[PDB]
Amino acid sequence: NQQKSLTLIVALTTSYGIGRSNSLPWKLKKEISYFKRVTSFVPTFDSFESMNVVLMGRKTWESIPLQFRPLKGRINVVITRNESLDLGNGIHSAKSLDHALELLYRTYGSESSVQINRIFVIGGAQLYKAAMDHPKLDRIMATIIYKDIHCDVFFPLKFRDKEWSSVWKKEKHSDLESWVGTKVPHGKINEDGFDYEFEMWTRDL
Numbered sequence: 001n002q003q004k005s006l007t008l009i010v011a012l013t014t015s016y017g018i019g020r021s022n023s024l025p026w027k028l029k030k031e032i033s034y035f036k037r038v039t040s041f042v043p044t045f046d047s048f049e050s051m052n053v054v055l056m057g058r059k060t061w062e063s064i065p066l067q068f069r070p071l072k073g074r075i076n077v078v079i080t081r082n083e084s085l086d087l088g089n090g091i092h093s094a095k096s097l098d099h100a101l102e103l104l105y106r107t108y109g110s111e112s113s114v115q116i117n118r119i120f121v122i123g124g125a126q127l128y129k130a131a132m133d134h135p136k137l138d139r140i141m142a143t144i145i146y147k148d149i150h151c152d153v154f155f156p157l158k159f160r161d162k163e164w165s166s167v168w169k170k171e172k173h174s175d176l177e178s179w180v181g182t183k184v185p186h187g188k189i190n191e192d193g194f195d196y197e198f199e200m201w202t203r204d205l
């Protein structure tokens with residue numbers, strides 16, 4: 001069902017809040033630009049065939065402006081145990097995280113003109129929970145928002161806290177840029193009265 005590592009990408013407050021009222025209680029144009037660049041990036045040589053995957057829960061799928069669904073240049077897969085007959089000219093649907101992985105590994109591969117590069121779990125507290133339990137998840141691309149904004153949905157596992165400090169390690173910034181390709185902003189970024197920062201955390205499998 002799985003060969004490649006999974007990577008989770010999330011934007012969260014220091015209180016682990018990730019959403020409110022089914023939206024994102026923060027408008028950060030540069031933060032979204034980073035999300036797009038990371039989830040889309042593939043090495044030059046492999047730029048011909050290779051392509052990244054973004055897995056998301058239904059509710060997170062709905063949260064994306066119709067203007068941006070599907071995420072261009074990336075294989076989208078919406079996890080949902082209930083079929084509501086909506087595909088929309090591509091969009092794969094999967095019963096579960098592991099079901100989605102086998103669908104992809106099946107759909108693509110040898111007889112495939114398009115190959116898979118990286119797989120990103122982009123969200124939903126529910127899908128985040130499942131991913132944190134998955135034996136192939138070894139990387140978290142986190143954007144820390146330094147402000148206790150009000151949220152009603154939170155990240156399931158406190159990976160930045162001491163209790164998890166022997167498992168999850170924060171990577172050097174230079175290594176972040178390397179894995180990500182281009183140079184990324186170092187230190188806190190201010191935009192709309194919000195100060196945030198990019199961090200990459202890894203786990204040994």
Ligand SMILES: NC(=O)c1ccc[n+]([C@@H]2O[C@H](COP(=O)([O-])OP(=O)(O)OC[C@H]3O[C@@H](n4cnc5c(N)ncnc54)[C@H](OP(=O)(O)O)[C@@H]3O)[C@@H](O)[C@H]2O)c1
Binds near residue numbers: 010019023024081
């Ligand atoms: N800060 C961030 O980076 C970030 C990222 C993602 C989402 N969010 C926010 O989170 C909120 C959405 O809440 P949410 O946590 O409910 O979204 P979610 O986890 O993405 O969506 C859950 C829904 O997705 C499907 N799903 C997710 N995990 C599943 C699993 N493990 N097995 C089977 N089905 C699964 C479901 O299908 P069914 O409906 O058929 O049951 C379920 O109702 C919004 O406010 C959104 O903007 C923030």
Ligand SMILES: Cc1nc(N)nc2[nH]cc(CCc3ccc(C(=O)N[C@@H](CCC(=O)O)C(=O)O)cc3)c12
Binds near residue numbers: 123
């Ligand atoms: C916002 C955000 N930031 C980070 N760092 N991780 C995250 N993981 C999951 C989400 C969920 C929300 C989310 C994701 C993508 C778009 C979106 O429309 N993206 C377009 C960008 C359009 C643009 O440049 O405005 C895309 O192409 O990726 C909107 C909301 C998220």
